[PDB]
Paper text:
Sugen kinase 223 (SgK223) (also known as Pragmin) and SgK269 (also known as PEAK1) are closely related proteins of 149 and 193 kDa, respectively. Both are classified as pseudokinases due to the substitution of critical residues within highly conserved motifs known to be essential for kinase activity, and both are predicted to function as scaffolds. A recent study found SgK223 and Csk were co-localized at focal adhesions where they regulate cell morphology and motility. Consistent with these findings, SgK223 has emerged as an important regulator of cell morphology, migration and invasion. To gain further insight into the molecular mechanism that drives SgK223 dimerization and oligomerization functions, we solved the crystal structure of the PsK domain of SgK223 and its adjacent regulatory domains.
To fully understand the structural determinants that drive SgK223 dimerization, we solved the crystal structure of a construct (SgK223- αN1-PsK-Cter) that encompasses the PsK domain and the adjacent N- and C-regulatory domains using the multi-wavelength anomalous dispersion method. The structure was refined against native data to 2.95 Å resolution. SgK223 crystallized in space group P43212 with one molecule in the asymmetric unit. Within a monomer, the PsK domain of SgK223 adopts a typical kinase-like fold and the N-terminal helix αN1 directly interacts with the C-terminal helices αJ and αK, while αL helix slides under αI helix of the PsK domain revealing an unusual ‘XL’-shaped helix bundle. While the asymmetric unit contains a monomer, the P43212 crystal form revealed a two-fold symmetric dimer with an extensive buried surface area (BSA) of 1620 Å2. SgK223 dimer formation is mediated by the regulatory helices from the two monomers with the αN1 and the αJ helices from one monomer interacting with the corresponding αJ and αN1 helices from the second monomer to form a unique ‘XX’-shaped four-helix bundle at the ‘core’ of the dimer and positioning the PsK domains peripherally to form the ‘shell’ of the dimer. The most notable feature is the absence of a structured αC helix, a critical feature in bona fide kinases. Instead, in SgK223, the conserved β3 Lys1024 from the YAVK motif makes H-bond interactions with Gln1048 from the loop preceding the β4 strand. The structure of SgK223 clearly demonstrates an absence of an ATP-binding cavity, which is instead occupied by the side chains of residues Tyr1008, Cys1001, Gln1048 and Leu1152. Residues from the αF and αG helices and the end of the A-loop contribute to this interface by intimately packing into a groove created by N-lobe residues Leu994, Trp989, Tyr1009, Ile1025, Phe1054, Val1058 and Val1089 of the PsK domain.
Numbering used by the authors:
A (entry chain A), B (entry chain A): 944 to 976, 984 to 1029, 1040 to 1064, 1082 to 1158, 1208 to 1217, 1239 to 1335, 1346 to 1405
Write the structure that this text describes.
């Protein structure tokens, strides 16, 4: 059966799909895997917080029942999910009494949640400290923004699939976690009169907030917080402010923001389409029966991906990174149809 | 340029060749990298020998100048090479006085050579202890024999290229060494009247001895040691004894032995051709402008090889083995021409 050239090479093209799905499965294995009475088992590692997100403050802790691993103690300032890589996992909660010095009269009652992932900083912290870096090296920063946004989309989509809408997404509530075996791991933190806001508009709400976040990540102000015409009039995507063209990602990110900030909650782009767009900005086909051409591109990108992984197996300090995983997720589900969707969403 | 299907897939076919050559280079990195006065630096680990080859006895030792690694002390019973994976590397020598108890009147003067590789056993030891195993599970054993023979060919070829002919190859002088990061690593140990034996016949001598070794590895006697007609007459390959057909490798190994034992030292098969034949027996095309068909086979085998390596990069205890390296060496230099050579040498 190996006599026909393209019969064999069409046979190969299927086995790239095969391995890539297997690679994603194993990569998922790699990067992944209490009550008020059980709190005795815990022990804060130090007196300093590792992260402060306004909504809560974080302290690394160890558990005597679980030696070798570390937990994050989330102390909420306020007076249910299936597991995902980009979603904060709560392991139990209670009410404790905390010295006011730890929250930055002598003590306050706080809700204490036990988190599996220890945050290095928040997204707002990252934005706050990277203005000069964005100015100096725009392409590196804006690519990083696309990676964070991609992870954010993965989390939001997993939340939406199981009936959860985060009523307020903000940079302060997006946790950046260290990740090995550099690009951080993004994690979305947890929180008869009819409703003033319908369930319909809540469905396309994460998309709307994400559009605002794109501005905030690229060191631009919230458009509605600066332009009164956007608060008072029925605007259109043309009315939305632009971004300084500093790199290859700036136009595509501006386009994506406009697509996410469309006033009509029906013609607005879903979160899964935004994901595919970010994917296109990162690895996807650039400007250069078109499906056949795309089929070739997918096959070539898959072969080059398998090549990078194969060379990592024999290199003693090149190893598998989060970027490799995310890139595999894209190429494994890559189809010429969906790529076309994303290409003219980017109006290319 | 990615518009044409087979233009792209012919573009891929070149990049498999690219990576595979790179994989071989890095695999080579992985599996690879004194006087009488310096002997003070050394220290035998224990009182027991780790290997006895008749020609010499081996003792593991440590060096104070080189902590963390182990050396093998080769004590020769007798009263210059470039580096290769299958060739014993001497690091210095001298004459020492050894208690006669260590050689298995109270002491004897022995030549002591410092070896980089610590042997587990010899090939004859392996043959001696595996008769039942060969009887019980023939295919596993005979495949192992092909792997050892392959490594032996790699060593002999590297020796011949640099003007060295091992005047006596025997199973006792072939050292099996442990190898990680199971299939052992084979290592070839070191040693006016005109010459009775010409330089011409010495050129095809390693091939002749290898042919005898094939019989000895498969638990069969040396043909010349059992058949008088072979010692007294000008025999032909038809006169050479057969092997019991116990597995898929038995006919091909018998064929290879006959090819190596051809009486005429000119029509005899070289050591490099025997290598390609063993390669064919292990991974090569089986019985099922034929170059185009072979091109497809090479490309498919390369893609499957890159797949195995890529899946090893994300598997925490599947890792790169010696068999993977040897298989890469074959596929990286695989050409339809040379494969045809081997296929009808196996009279297929």
């Amino acid at each position: 059966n190996i006599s026909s050239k393209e019969g064999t090479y069409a046979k190969l093209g299927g086995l790239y799909t095969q391995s890539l799905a297997r690679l994603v499965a194993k990569c998922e294995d790699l990067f992944m895997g209490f009550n008020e009475n059980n709190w005795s088992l815990f022990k804060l590692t130090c007196n300093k917080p590792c992260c402060d997100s306004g909504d809560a403050i974080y302290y690394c802790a160890t558990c005597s029942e679980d030696p070798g691993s570390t937990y994050a103690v989330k102390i909420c300032k306020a007076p249910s999910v299936p597991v995902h890589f980009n979603i904060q996992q709560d392991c139990g909660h209670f009410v404790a009494s905390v010295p006011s010095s730890m929250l930055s009269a002598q003590e306050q009652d706080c809700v204490v949640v036990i988190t599996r992932e220890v945050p290095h900083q928040t997204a707002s912290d990252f934005v706050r400290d990277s203005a000069a870096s964005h100015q100096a090296e725009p392409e590196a920063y804006e690519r990083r923004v696309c990676f964070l946004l991609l992870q954010l989309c993965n989390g939001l989509e997993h939340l939406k699939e199981h009936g959860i809408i985060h009523r307020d997404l903000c940079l302060e509530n997006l946790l950046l976690v260290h990740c090995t075996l550099q690009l951080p791991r993004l994690i979305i933190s947890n929180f008869l009169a009819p409703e003033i806001v319908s369930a319909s508009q809540y469905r396309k709400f994460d998309e709307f907030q994400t559009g605002i976040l794109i501005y905030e990540l690229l060191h631009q102000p919230n458009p509605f917080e600066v332009r009164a015409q956007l608060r008072e009039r029925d605007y259109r995507q043309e009315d939305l402010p632009p971004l300084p063209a500093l790199s290859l990602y700036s136009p595509g990110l501006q386009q994506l923001a406009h697509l996410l900030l469309e006033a009509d909650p029906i013609k607005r782009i879903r979160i899964g389409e935004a994901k595919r767009v970010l994917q296109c900005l990162l690895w996807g086909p650039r400007r250069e029966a078109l499906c056949g051409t795309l089929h070739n591109w997918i096959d070539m990108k898959r072969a080059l991906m398998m090549m990078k992984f194969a060379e990592k197996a024999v290199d003693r300090r090149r190893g598998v990174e989060l970027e490799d995983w995310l890139c595999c997720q894209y190429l494994a589900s890559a189809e010429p149809g969906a790529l076309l969707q994303s290409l003219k969403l980017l109006q290319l």
